[PDB]
Amino acid sequence: GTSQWLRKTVDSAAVILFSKTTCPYCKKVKDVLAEAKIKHATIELDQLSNGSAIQKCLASFSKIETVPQMFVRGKFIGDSQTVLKYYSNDELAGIVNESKYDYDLIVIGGGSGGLAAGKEAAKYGAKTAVLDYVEPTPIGTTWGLGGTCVNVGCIPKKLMHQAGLLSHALEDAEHFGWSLDRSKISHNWSTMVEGVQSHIGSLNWGYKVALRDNQVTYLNAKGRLISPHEVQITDKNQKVSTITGNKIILATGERPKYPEIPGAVEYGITSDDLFSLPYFPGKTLVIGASYVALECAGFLASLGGDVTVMVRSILLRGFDQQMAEKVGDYMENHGVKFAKLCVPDEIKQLKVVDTENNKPGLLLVKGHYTDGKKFEEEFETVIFAVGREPQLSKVLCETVGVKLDKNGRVVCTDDEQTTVSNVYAIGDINAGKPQLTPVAIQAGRYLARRLFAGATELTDYSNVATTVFTPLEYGACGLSEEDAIEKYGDKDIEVYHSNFKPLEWTVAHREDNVCYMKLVCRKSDNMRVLGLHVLGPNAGEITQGYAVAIKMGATKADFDRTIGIHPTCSETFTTLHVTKKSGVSPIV
Amino acid sequence: GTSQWLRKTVDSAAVILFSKTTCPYCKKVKDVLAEAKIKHATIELDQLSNGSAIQKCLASFSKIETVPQMFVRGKFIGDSQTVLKYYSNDELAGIVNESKYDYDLIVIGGGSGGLAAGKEAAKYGAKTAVLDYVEPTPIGTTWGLGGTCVNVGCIPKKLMHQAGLLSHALEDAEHFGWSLDRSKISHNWSTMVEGVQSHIGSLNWGYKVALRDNQVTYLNAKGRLISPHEVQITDKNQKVSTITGNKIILATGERPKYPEIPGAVEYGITSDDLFSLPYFPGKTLVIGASYVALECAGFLASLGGDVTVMVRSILLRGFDQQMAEKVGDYMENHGVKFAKLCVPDEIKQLKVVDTENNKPGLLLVKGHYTDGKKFEEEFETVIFAVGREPQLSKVLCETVGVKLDKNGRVVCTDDEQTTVSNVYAIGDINAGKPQLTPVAIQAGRYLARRLFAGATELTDYSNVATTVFTPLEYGACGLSEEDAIEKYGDKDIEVYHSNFKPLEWTVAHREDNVCYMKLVCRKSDNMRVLGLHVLGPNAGEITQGYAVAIKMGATKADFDRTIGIHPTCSETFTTLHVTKKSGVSPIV
Ligand SMILES: Cc1cc2nc3c(=O)[nH]c(=O)nc-3n(C[C@H](O)[C@H](O)[C@H](O)COP(=O)(O)OP(=O)(O)OC[C@H]3O[C@@H](n4cnc5c(N)ncnc54)[C@H](O)[C@@H]3O)c2cc1C
Ligand SMILES: Cc1cc2nc3c(=O)[nH]c(=O)nc-3n(C[C@H](O)[C@H](O)[C@H](O)COP(=O)(O)OP(=O)(O)OC[C@H]3O[C@@H](n4cnc5c(N)ncnc54)[C@H](O)[C@@H]3O)c2cc1C
């Protein structure tokens, strides 16, 4: 197995140095390369269990078993002497720059995963190009470098969430003694958007600067893979050209879906438009029930908006449905209206958006409930959050041979490789993976290390924790209760649960027995924690640390013998004792 | 070893039933006892690895090997038949109530640990009495049932912390778009104290109700242990009497120390007085540098007070000193003044406290710096936070034989047993243990299970996580960096660290590169995480979950292969890569 790994490492690395820590000639090579600003991977064989066997198999490539050994793009360059020879003769730059391709790596997509991968690859000497282009939304919205999370996802989403949370902080401030009349305080949408967009701009810029500092080429151009190693780029000026790369990383992400009803594209918006909307949405209808729909509905309501969510069937399909209902119940009790069991039929325009005064238009939404009653109501803004989809036909020529699944996502091995061996896919377009920013980052960085630094560490996609930033946040790690029962049988599942009340909520006169947490455990596996679920403030901060313990195979006993930090919400996980089987009430 | 455990279990349990799940006569006994409202412990032998050997050793007590077997206070009562005989003959109440002592358990101290222990003991049929008395502070401050945390510690402390945090929420609200002028908002101390004291009152009451519902006798009387089994109680009316108990739990906690300088007792206050103070402290001097001192100084400043902390030498002695300095630096940059290397010499009174208008007095504090310069400044309130101490001479007659250490704390075995075999100590008075509310609760509950339900689980006092609720919170679990280097040598310690910025702080224009986290790891033990440290918002929520993973022996690799939740502060722990050895800057 070692021989197989070395052959792949040598073929793939752009510039790699085989060396040892306790080695003088190696350090001489290292310091030379550093002075010439030649980045490279390094593998200290003395720090590997199979080092000596690798040092021996190396001779199959270099005809020698000594260190240091320096390779460039699959070719042995030389020992200490031959490198200094190339250096003193000022032939070294041309040697390390010699390639069949323009780049060692072309990243198509400048998002969470693509930027992470490209940055990490350049760290090890890979000549890297990052392509990013943002196809405007139907109304013309566009944005800068960074992807969905940075521009029209997590970042603006959580900042607007924060602005909504401050609403309740303003309410709580009175009970804690602050001379404040919440009822005389209003929110200015455009002031918030200005600050949100200023921060996004600082990220767009920080990314450009980061790529320049790491000698990464950034091209604001639409990329199209026409052969395994050839990418066709169209720039702002419609100019077409071709660049070649050894490895290709597809990281193009997804975009929001629209329902196929009249008026939807013309008069509605999506999350892509919401976070830079130059006017307050006003009375808003959110169509959909995903975490995007509920998060957006949630903070609009907390900002004082008249918000309605049109729900076709259930909330947060794919999430623990007990928790989903508690999420929705909280929102419905805190200003969010729900048109349940209802779908839209058409969007009719009543007022055009006022560009000059920054005011929304006005729309008539027609729909129908399952009970046959008609839905007809006026809204100033209609937001569709009915899923997202890849658009790889715009990126992949069918002739290249990259296998897509029925949903249009890329079918990959557990090392992100597509059916074209030099082409990989990371992030949301990777079929079957959790569609989250830290997953894409870890996938891209770990892939870059395997390609160009000889690493073997794969990304672990199991038990990836999540948090839905609804008005009351919901964090989760592992299986939902229903999936655990499905997988192992009701008799083999024990569920410990408890309501709780944040100490912060007491003086503030907020609700008993609404915040809630549960551990879904497997009786036959020493009460292994299969899933953790918490509804309450700062649920992301609560949940994160437990994800490490679950990764390690935490049991209920592991939670119990850990001591709580008091007063916190998270400590309740260390004293859970009421089981669902017992029928005892979880209230406190 | 089994025989030893059974002998202790039988001797100690008040009412215990040996049984099996798949047993008909057992359920008959259970249902009888339930109807008669006789609480008891139960041990299903079919759910123990050593069950059959226990069922056999049982005959050494009962002369039989069958189930069910019912014991009362060390005496076999009978099988199914003999119980129903006692029941039908209405002799069963007198049997289970038969004892040499008035109580199976007398808890001296109605605090975190004592109430937890007493409640859990009654759950298994132990006739329990909880004694609580609150010796007034020098100025006459007193409070109700619950202990230090409930009345004059964590609970009011964190609520006032929350009131201080709301100050910055009010500041942040503007940048997030809220039509709010922070500069025109003031804080009303007495309104906050009213709400804080209302919540404490609901806890005082909830505890009384809980003890009544569990048939626990609550005595508001000063307890004094005069012999192993005899407690002398003095009530409000100075009436003296004696009650006897089989097991005794000492849970009397500590009280604040005063420095031996003129004016300190007469004119200063402590935390015991702060949280019900009927007047705003005004310009305040906090003398001390513990987490109490900094927490109290912190929230007073955030409420707009003119606050000074007089620090003799370093901050937070016993905590990681890198983190302590970052804590202090943040406070000094956010309105807290520090009189460094300074001690007090005397407190002179300039104004008496105004009882009628609720206004503080006025004090002249005289002291001196290490450089010889005199300290002389006027303060309206002077708070001493210079440590806490037990007062067991007021509780333990020297003749009983309970060994105390030099500091006056009880020297205990790892099962909380004192040098008097029926007397145990939990909580802050237990020498050498972390002085925290969840430790006392876990100790008391687990002890109660060992005494009266045959449990063997001990409390694990290692790697207990902490959080200091200073204006910028500091959570920690495990070793400080300096202690790890002391214990294993600098060469065997790797420290990964990073600054970070909460997303919430970006639009709010708060500080880059102030929040900070580090993992202190042991190179030779697979990079085992010896200590985790985080300075930032919600640090208690962040830290808790990682305490489980550290309990399980988390390595750095365990943190790395876990995926982050984005956007959170806690996710930064899953991507740490800068080491201290590397000299690379931790900034972002
Ligand atoms: C409202 C919303 C909120 C979200 N909140 C969270 C959250 O809180 N936490 C979390 O973990 N995840 C969240 N997500 C998901 C997160 O944004 C994605 O998982 C993440 O962006 C995926 O990164 P990626 O690299 O796979 O794709 P992307 O980030 O979308 O990057 C793809 C980039 O490639 C561009 N591109 C497309 N085609 C081409 C082409 N031919 N040539 C060049 N460039 C091209 C795209 O325009 C884009 O710029 C949210 C998503 C949405 C819509
Ligand atoms: C300002 C302050 C803030 C704190 N914040 C935190 C925090 O955030 N998180 C945390 O985990 N810990 C915190 N602590 C520590 C926490 O309060 C203690 O660890 C906890 O109270 C210990 O519980 P205990 O049972 O050992 O003692 P206690 O809670 O103090 O209970 C002892 C009870 O017994 C009474 N008593 C004494 N003598 C007698 C007698 N002869 N007869 C009858 N009754 C008697 C006492 O008056 C008292 O009511 C804080 C402490 C202080 C002073």
Ligand SMILES: Nc1cccc2nsnc12
């Ligand atoms: N529990 C709930 C609240 C609001 C809308 C819903 N659709 S399904 N379940 C719901």
Ligand SMILES: Nc1cccc2nsnc12
């Ligand atoms: N870093 C610090 C800030 C304020 C007071 C201090 N005493 S010691 N170190 C300190």
Ligand SMILES: [Ca+2]
């Ligand atoms: Ca616990």
Ligand SMILES: [Ca+2]
């Ligand atoms: Ca990670």
